[PDB]
Nucleic acid binder design. Structure first.
Ligand SMILES: COc1ccc2nccc(CCN3CCC(NCc4ccc(Cl)cc4)CC3)c2n1
Ligand SMILES: [Cl-]
Ligand SMILES: [Mn+2]
Ligand SMILES: [Mn+2]
Ligand SMILES: [Mn+2]
Ligand SMILES: [Mn+2]
Lengths: 671, 671
DNA sequence: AGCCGTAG
DNA sequence: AGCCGTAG
DNA sequence: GTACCTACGGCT
DNA sequence: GTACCTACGGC
């Protein structure tokens, strides 16, 4: 992949390490091939602080860098053999580019420290704003980033080896906890010191993954990519009453407008939202191959089509009534929602799993009937205990059904945000003829790959680690649903075999609850009640702001109607005034002065079509004014009393529970 | 390998479904009856065994997986009693590409597993039409329509006549193009299945679709469907030169869903080529970012790049919304797309075309726009002009990459017959480099030659000692210098001999084989230069006539509305009275029609008039537009009244485009 | 172990 | 003999 | 994140 | 038409 320079004098040669083959090509065309070589890197590179030496030396990108530098590594390092006296790290001016910069400096620090000591390592400063370097023309890349006359290289300086050892170990090492402590301590929610570069670049990445990638918002239960998919469905009018739109149109629109990342991240997030084995309350309605419980992917996006589910309407309801704050998108050309109205408790209903930096999240899904009953109970008693809430919310409710063993993992998880919940397949023992039995499995645990669970059992049989199994078949079908059959040898105890299968395979699997979500923009480990309280506060805010919006808009409309009423009662004088006016401006001024009209009222009268002077329009306008004064009074009543507002939240939660509430699928059995 | 087997080990009742890939495979896996139905997904187009050598057939992954699956072995070692399925079901996608892959499969079975067909073990599934792949289908629809024994219609492949079948597989699938071409021209219309009938009908379906709807350009606008749909999508999304670049994914996503039911890479790569100044003599797309290089680097992935129309692409689209060209239904009946673009410059000859179809191909070189328009103008003044006279305007091809053409006799034969060989050469000079030594410096290479591959070939000849006298080889190409390839020559060696050897042994000399095939009245045709210009000029005459006819209808319709508004202004008191004394819009419309002798359209426009239209300035604006339209209408009538004025208007508009976009010749034609 | 799911 | 450009 | 199989025809 | 790389955390 190396595109070398022509000069064989290392003193004046430079090698640019660029994030992406997409940037590689721009930089190859734009470079000065006499003195500038290019080695493009395919995305995230090996973290050498976590990897053992066998994996480091077999890694394609590391090998290409070692061959290109020509110095060898560690103990066999020789600075005099360096093929370039400038090694230039040139990544995108975004958080993933900072991450790649931390990974490259970790490699140089641990295998090529004298390269840094000699002042041979530099960071390029490409201009900010742009997509990647792949969005830049060759000439822009040359003039801003690569051209000796104009560019600003940072030379990487090592000041203090002990501090640097400790920084690489803490930031990039296998011990998560010190990285988490660093993030919590530091997070605000010509030359470059390597320790400063590593701490600042890693913190930029960690914080961005925490607040803007991997973790859901407590209020609507969404990560940014899901929020942008649902918002795009909404803005393109992809409602349940409309036909399915081609997945590429949805994904293309979301990529350009809201989500400046790869198409696969968007499409696969949308596919999960459509799978009834992944989402307890699916958010997308898919037509075509949307994957299986066997880990089949969806068909490529050219094939599949999608729209909202009915319940997704409830995530988006009131978004256009100033219920939630809009923000600038990534390039300032669009607006997107910071959070959805979320008129049902989506965080807990659909759950969330994510790997961030310094932390992860693992929130199981729940029954919507149970959750809303819980919110209602909380709404009537701010002091309700977790144990009282568990009279409404028995425990998780998986889309895949199955069993939970006992209540003690559920209780610790609801109390602390952490606990181990044992999920068991639904299996029964049945006769199959001539005194023989089988185990039949019709439900498996949440997030278990059925085919992979079957291969694991087949492995135990083949390797003789389990006695008594004579055959193993997936008889799953559209007619039967999931059906895995394990034949038992005549006179073997099938109950012993089953208990052994639970021990030795994913037929029993734990759900490690770790309820981390964004609360006021910061990650926090939350308990069940804390999660319900933030949700209920969101609903109160949503319904208060919607009532405030409806009130402004109803007063604005009453104001226009007062103006139209004047105009129709005085139509001869209105028309005379307009006709005798040379311009809009003169007409506006004369109407305001003669009939006590506001600018907006005069504007509306000037915009009135001649058809609005028909006989029964005067009466249609009087009817609407009377209904609005009535409407205005109802809205004021709601805003005047926190109890009426709260009763309106309860009633709307109750309507959604009655329309979308369903039976529990997962059975909770005594442990 | 990829086989998902059935559970029954009794071949008599087992079926294997051959589907295109995992996108279809997944629907098929979810829908199947796993007791008796196995699925082997393929990997798209399979090896044509009638054209391939035996070593490549036996090492081909998909052929091996099918052989292993069937369990019968092949040719001489074939054993029907070892067959693992008594039904082998071809279930390709229902598109023409699905039919092609079916012809390739039947060719394989016929040549290597003939007894499989003789025994009645090969079947064709009939999945429903209007689905691009089975991945578009829900698993239940695939089961009920195509796979379910109770309802499906399988075709059993019958062999009736082995001699006829031998001759059919040889003609359709064998390496002799001419018999396949004769078959296409003879047959092209511009329970049980006989294998001969299936092969002829399915192959003809593919051949005709690739000829009329893929690989060959229309003589009128010079475009293939994928280019036309990219430019139309640029138009419909408002992606004009005055607007900012839109992300490539939005363009490609839109074109895929609405117009082009094929892979995203066929769309994006076609759009990339249209943006490269080394591929298109008059680039049709304006790209931002990495759009590839002369070294065969691709564009960056579509997330990284942005695009809009070039100014000259405005001239391809100009007047498309003035009923100049016939719209047709898109692939699914949900959208409209153009059959052809207005093409206000001679784009077929200007940008040229290369395409591989079935039974034929096309190879049309690009041309200088100034020369071509001069040629159209000369043709316009003399229908009887000779090829020789036209060559006073059009010297020969003009490549975006410049270089030299050797002599006029290939150009002449190609312009006279549609076929001829054009010898292209690099621009190479011999220059001194100091100390009595010389070098060859190449600053232009031939059209469609990969510069890096040309350099690797020279390096190969030096290393293998097949060329004497070369001491160094450098690409000194840069944005400042443009293309610069330096070949150092050994002291006292003849650099002119070395250059002539490079012309012999490398792409530094390369031929362009002209083969000017295009769609004429929807049928492929070998055309000469004059025929190409005649169809172009007839297109322009029709476009300008239809635009004048459209402008005239629309101007009369608009004058008719303005006559209505003028009456309303002249009698405004009576108009207002009439509307005010009407109960409803309907009654008002009727009374205006009766009282002022107005049409429905005129009454509706009066009813739609806003009160601000009654101000001085707005009254004057209605009078001013009526007067301008009467003048416009009179000019349009004068054009339609005289074919010479119409033709003079074509000439003047071609002349404007020549003056604005016409540029210097780049390729030198040497005698 | 290597899996879950958003990233390059 | 392998390249060119729309296709699976 | 990026790369390599396949068809097809006519030049070399 | 699709197959292999990477970070990141917790079990
Ligand atoms: C698939 O299997 C393999 C196997 C091997 C591969 N080796 C290298 C590179 C790729 C990826 C190529 N390809 C991905 C999808 C992109 N198009 C999506 C897209 C569609 C629509 C829209 Cl709007 C946006 C993006 C094109 C590039 C490999 N892929
Ligand atoms: Cl209007
Ligand atoms: Mn980036
Ligand atoms: Mn297909
Ligand atoms: Mn009159
Ligand atoms: Mn990816």
């Amino acid at each position: 992949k190396l595109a070398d320079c022509s000069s064989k004098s290392p003193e004046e040669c430079e090698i640019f390490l660029v994030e992406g083959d997409s940037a590689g090509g721009s930089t190859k065309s734009g470079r000065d091939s006499r003195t500038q070589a290019i080695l493009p890197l395919r995305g995230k590179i090996l973290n050498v602080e976590k990897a053992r030496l066998d994996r480091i030396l077999n890694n394609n990108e590391i090998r290409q860098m070692i061959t290109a530098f020509g110095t060898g590594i560690g103990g066999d390092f020789d600075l005099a053999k360096a093929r370039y006296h400038k090694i230039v790290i040139m990544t995108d001016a975004d958080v993933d580019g900072a991450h790649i910069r931390t990974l490259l400096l970790t490699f140089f620090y641990r295998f090529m420290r004298p390269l840094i000591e000699a002042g041979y390592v530099y960071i390029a400063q490409p201009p900010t704003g742009y997509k990647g370097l792949g969005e830049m023309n060759a000439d822009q890349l040359w003039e801003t980033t690569m051209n000796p006359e104009h560019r600003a290289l940072l030379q990487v300086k090592l000041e203090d080896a002990i501090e640097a050892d400790q920084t690489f170990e803490m930031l990039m090492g296998d011990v998560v906890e010190n990285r988490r402590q660093f993030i919590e301590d530091n997070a605000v929610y010509n030359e470059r010191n390597i320790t400063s570069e590593m701490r600042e670049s890693f913190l930029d990445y960690a914080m961005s993954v925490i607040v803007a990638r991997a973790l859901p918002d407590v209020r609507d239960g969404l990560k940014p990519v899901h929020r942008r998919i649902l918002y795009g469905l909404n803005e393109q009018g992809m409602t349940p009453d409309k036909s399915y739109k081609k997945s590429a149109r949805i994904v293309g629109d979301v990529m350009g407008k809201y989500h400046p990342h790869g198409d696969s991240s968007i499409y696969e997030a949308m596919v999960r939202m459509a799978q009834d084995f992944s989402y307890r309350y699916p958010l997308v309605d898919g037509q075509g191959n949307f994957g299986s419980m066997d880990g089949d992917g969806a068909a490529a996006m050219r094939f599949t089509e999608a729209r909202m589910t009915k319940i997704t309407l409830e995530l988006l309801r009131d978004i256009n009534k100033d219920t939630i704050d809009f923000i600038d998108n990534y390039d300032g050309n669009e607006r997107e929602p910071s959070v959805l109205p979320a008129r049902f408790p989506n965080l807990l209903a659909n759950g969330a799993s994510g790997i961030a930096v310094g932390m992860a999240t693992n929130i199981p899904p729940h029954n919507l009937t149970e959750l809303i009953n819980g919110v209602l109970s909380l709404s009537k008693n701010p002091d309700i205990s977790i144990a009282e809430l568990m009279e409404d919310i028995e425990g998780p409710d998986f889309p895949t059904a199955g069993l939970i063993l006992g209540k003690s993992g559920i209780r610790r998880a609801y109390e602390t945000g952490r606990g181990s919940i044992q999920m068991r397949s639904r299996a029964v023992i049945e006769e199959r003829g001539g005194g023989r039995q089988r185990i039949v499995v019709t439900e498996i645990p949440f997030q278990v790959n059925k085919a992979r669970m079957i291969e694991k059992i087949a492995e135990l049989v083949r390797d003789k680690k389990i006695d008594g199994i004579t055959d193993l078949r997936d008889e799953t079908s559209l007619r039967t649903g999931v059906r895995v059959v394990i034949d038992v040898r005549k006179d073997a105890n099938a109950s012993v075999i089953l208990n052994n299968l639970y021990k030795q395979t994913p037929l029993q699997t734990s759900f490690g609850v770790n309820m981390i979500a964004l609360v006021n923009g910061r990650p926090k480990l939350i308990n069940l009640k804390e999660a319900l309280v933030h949700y209920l506060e969101h609903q109160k805010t949503v319904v208060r702001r919607r009532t405030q919006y409806n009130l402004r808009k109803a007063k604005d409309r009453a104001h226009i109607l007062e103006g139209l009423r004047i105009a129709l009662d005085h139509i001869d004088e209105i028309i005379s005034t307009i006709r005798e006016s040379d311009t809009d401006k003169v007409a506006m001024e004369s109407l305001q002065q003669r009939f006590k009209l506001s600018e907006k009222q005069a504007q509306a009268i000037l915009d009135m079509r001649l058809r609005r002077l028909t006989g029964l329009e005067r009466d249609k306008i009087e009817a609407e004014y009377n209904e609005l004064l009535n409407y205005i009074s109802e809205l004021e009543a709601i805003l005047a009393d926190e109890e009426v507002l709260l009763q309106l939240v309860r009633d709307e939660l109750t309507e959604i529970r009655d329309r979308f509430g369903d039976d529990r699928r997962t059975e909770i059995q005594l442990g």
